[PDB]
Write a protein that binds this ligand. Structure first.
Ligand SMILES: [Zn+2]
Ligand SMILES: [Zn+2]
Length: 86
């Protein structure tokens, strides 16, 4: 009379650690990553020339942070030149 045999096993591994990258540069509150073009806004914020363009066509003329009536044409403040039907 052996009566077979039984047992039990449990393996676990917890660990809560992380190293935050150097955040010493205005980041994009839209995509949450390094600015693509690094374009500024007239309202008073900084976003990716691409992100800002998507936010407008996506939702509409509004800031992704303050939702303030903002237009595209009113962008590209970094450019020290305004070539208009020159
Ligand atoms: Zn972005
Ligand atoms: Zn804004």
């Amino acid at each position: 009379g052996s009566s077979g045999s039984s047992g039990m096993e449990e393996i676990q591994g917890y660990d809560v650690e992380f190293d935050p990258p150097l955040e010493s540069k205005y980041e994009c509150p839209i995509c949450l990553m390094a600015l693509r073009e690094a374009v500024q806004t007239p309202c008073g914020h900084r976003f990716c020339k691409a992100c800002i363009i998507k936010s407008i066509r996506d939702a509409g003329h509004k800031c992704p942070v303050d939702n303030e009536i903002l237009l595209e044409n009113q962008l590209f403040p970094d450019n020290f030149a305004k070539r208009e039907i020159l």
